[PDB]
Design an enzyme around this catalytic site. Sequence first.
Site, PDB file in Angstrom:
ATOM      1  N   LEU A  12       0.824  -1.204   0.000  1.00 54.82           N
ATOM      2  CA  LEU A  12       0.000   0.000   0.000  1.00 54.82           C
ATOM      3  C   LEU A  12       0.864   1.262   0.000  1.00 54.82           C
ATOM      4  O   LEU A  12       0.545   2.211  -0.703  1.00 54.82           O
ATOM      5  CB  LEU A  12      -0.973   0.013   1.191  1.00 54.82           C
ATOM      6  CG  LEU A  12      -2.089  -1.043   1.189  1.00 54.82           C
ATOM      7  CD1 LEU A  12      -2.943  -0.921   2.431  1.00 54.82           C
ATOM      8  CD2 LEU A  12      -2.954  -0.958  -0.076  1.00 54.82           C
ATOM      9  N   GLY A  13       1.940   1.258   0.777  1.00 55.95           N
ATOM     10  CA  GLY A  13       2.851   2.390   0.869  1.00 55.95           C
ATOM     11  C   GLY A  13       4.230   2.028   1.377  1.00 55.95           C
ATOM     12  O   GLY A  13       4.430   0.942   1.933  1.00 55.95           O
ATOM     13  N   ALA A  16      10.053   5.675   5.712  1.00 55.59           N
ATOM     14  CA  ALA A  16      11.371   5.626   6.354  1.00 55.59           C
ATOM     15  C   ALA A  16      11.473   4.442   7.317  1.00 55.59           C
ATOM     16  O   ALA A  16      12.524   3.803   7.381  1.00 55.59           O
ATOM     17  CB  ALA A  16      11.644   6.929   7.094  1.00 55.59           C
ATOM     18  N   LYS A  35       1.262  -1.969   9.115  1.00 60.15           N
ATOM     19  CA  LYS A  35       2.453  -1.123   9.090  1.00 60.15           C
ATOM     20  C   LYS A  35       3.608  -1.943   9.667  1.00 60.15           C
ATOM     21  O   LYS A  35       3.580  -2.316  10.845  1.00 60.15           O
ATOM     22  CB  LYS A  35       2.224   0.199   9.852  1.00 60.15           C
ATOM     23  CG  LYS A  35       3.332   1.224   9.646  1.00 60.15           C
ATOM     24  CD  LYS A  35       3.005   2.543  10.325  1.00 60.15           C
ATOM     25  CE  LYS A  35       4.123   3.538  10.170  1.00 60.15           C
ATOM     26  NZ  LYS A  35       3.752   4.872  10.707  1.00 60.15           N
ATOM     27  N   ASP A 119       1.805  16.552  11.083  1.00 67.97           N
ATOM     28  CA  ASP A 119       2.219  16.271   9.692  1.00 67.97           C
ATOM     29  C   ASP A 119       1.004  16.082   8.803  1.00 67.97           C
ATOM     30  O   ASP A 119       0.951  15.161   7.987  1.00 67.97           O
ATOM     31  CB  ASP A 119       3.176  15.074   9.571  1.00 67.97           C
ATOM     32  CG  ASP A 119       4.002  15.056   8.262  1.00 67.97           C
ATOM     33  OD1 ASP A 119       4.146  16.130   7.623  1.00 67.97           O
ATOM     34  OD2 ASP A 119       4.510  13.988   7.901  1.00 67.97           O
TER      35      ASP A 119
HETATM   36  C1  LIG Z   1      -6.868   1.623  -1.820  1.00 66.81           C
HETATM   37  O1  LIG Z   1      -5.624   2.272  -1.977  1.00 66.81           O
HETATM   38  C2  LIG Z   1      -4.881   2.611  -0.879  1.00 66.81           C
HETATM   39  C3  LIG Z   1      -5.257   2.321   0.466  1.00 66.81           C
HETATM   40  C4  LIG Z   1      -4.371   2.666   1.466  1.00 66.81           C
HETATM   41  C5  LIG Z   1      -3.129   3.290   1.205  1.00 66.81           C
HETATM   42  C6  LIG Z   1      -2.764   3.591  -0.114  1.00 66.81           C
HETATM   43  C7  LIG Z   1      -3.647   3.248  -1.176  1.00 66.81           C
HETATM   44  C8  LIG Z   1      -3.256   3.579  -2.602  1.00 66.81           C
HETATM   45  N1  LIG Z   1      -2.531   2.447  -3.188  1.00 66.81           N
HETATM   46  C9  LIG Z   1      -3.120   1.329  -3.795  1.00 66.81           C
HETATM   47  C10 LIG Z   1      -2.068   0.485  -4.133  1.00 66.81           C
HETATM   48  N2  LIG Z   1      -0.847   1.056  -3.759  1.00 66.81           N
HETATM   49  C11 LIG Z   1      -1.152   2.254  -3.205  1.00 66.81           C
HETATM   50  C12 LIG Z   1      -2.339   3.492   2.488  1.00 66.81           C
HETATM   51  C13 LIG Z   1      -3.307   2.983   3.515  1.00 66.81           C
HETATM   52  C14 LIG Z   1      -4.463   2.507   2.876  1.00 66.81           C
HETATM   53  N3  LIG Z   1      -5.351   2.086   3.831  1.00 66.81           N
HETATM   54  N4  LIG Z   1      -4.821   2.274   5.068  1.00 66.81           N
HETATM   55  C15 LIG Z   1      -3.556   2.838   4.905  1.00 66.81           C
HETATM   56  C16 LIG Z   1      -2.725   3.227   6.051  1.00 66.81           C
HETATM   57  C17 LIG Z   1      -3.179   3.089   7.383  1.00 66.81           C
HETATM   58  C18 LIG Z   1      -2.381   3.519   8.435  1.00 66.81           C
HETATM   59  C19 LIG Z   1      -1.110   4.074   8.164  1.00 66.81           C
HETATM   60  C20 LIG Z   1      -0.272   4.503   9.211  1.00 66.81           C
HETATM   61  N5  LIG Z   1       0.416   4.842  10.057  1.00 66.81           N
HETATM   62  C21 LIG Z   1      -0.643   4.200   6.871  1.00 66.81           C
HETATM   63  C22 LIG Z   1      -1.441   3.779   5.813  1.00 66.81           C
END
Ligand SMILES: COc1cc2c(cc1Cn1ccnc1)Cc1c-2n[nH]c1-c1ccc(C#N)cc1
Length: 260
Positions: A12-13, A16, A35, A119
């Site tokens: 998803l992300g 660091a 995470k 942030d």
């Molecule tokens: C449905 O799409 C998403 C969904 C989500 C994120 C990015 C995308 C976009 N994405 C889709 C595929 N790669 C990136 C990051 C995330 C998503 N759901 N929950 C989280 C998230 C939850 C908590 C934290 C923290 N700390 C960081 C991220």
Amino acid sequence: PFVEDWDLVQTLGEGAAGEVQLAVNRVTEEAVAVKIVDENIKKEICINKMLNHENVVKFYGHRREGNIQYLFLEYCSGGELFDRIEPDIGMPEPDAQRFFHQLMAGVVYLHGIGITHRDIKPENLLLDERDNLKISDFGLATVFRYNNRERLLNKMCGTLPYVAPELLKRREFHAEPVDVWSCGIVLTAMLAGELPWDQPSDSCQEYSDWKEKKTYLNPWKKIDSAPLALLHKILVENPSARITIPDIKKDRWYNKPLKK
Ligand SMILES: COc1cc2c(cc1Cn1ccnc1)Cc1c-2n[nH]c1-c1ccc(C#N)cc1
């Protein structure tokens, strides 16, 4: 049986600390965001355990498997607010007003329990299945109020285009006006699809132009007079004169009925 087993299906992300993965439960098919982190993590978990609000990403729990910390958080199928902002355009004004209302409800909640995010940016603002905004990542967050006693902050943190000018100019500062400022930059980004300056300093020409009220320039020329009058009250250099959230809730554009 097997209700405690999760499959990591996609990234998803990336950060660091490590990575964020979409985890799906083997039995129930429930989706959560994990995470994966290889003092900073301990505080993030403690702050996350305090949170319970409809505009704040849910915390389900944590599991340490050796030297790796696994934070179980809400999966938001709508993705990042960042991907709803069209570069140099923004988004329809009614969508930006609804997201701004939800962002204010979330920030009111955090400040009310004495937490400052520090942030706020569209990368940290997630959207659920009904496009409800959720504040995410409490890795830079801190307690600014405890036992009804406010403590002034002094630590340099956030992201330069979203930080308040007092962070760069003053040794100590109140936490709440800093989060209000970053919400004003988010609002600018939603309505113009661009950030007004690299940083809020006199050395920055775009920041000087704003203090000289040159609203005939970008991004301000793309923004209607009613949300722009709100931005004039939020993006005030002196944090003691900057509008507070109770007064933002009384603003004319904030209460303007809008429909696409
Ligand atoms: C449905 O799409 C998403 C969904 C989500 C994120 C990015 C995308 C976009 N994405 C889709 C595929 N790669 C990136 C990051 C995330 C998503 N759901 N929950 C989280 C998230 C939850 C908590 C934290 C923290 N700390 C960081 C991220």
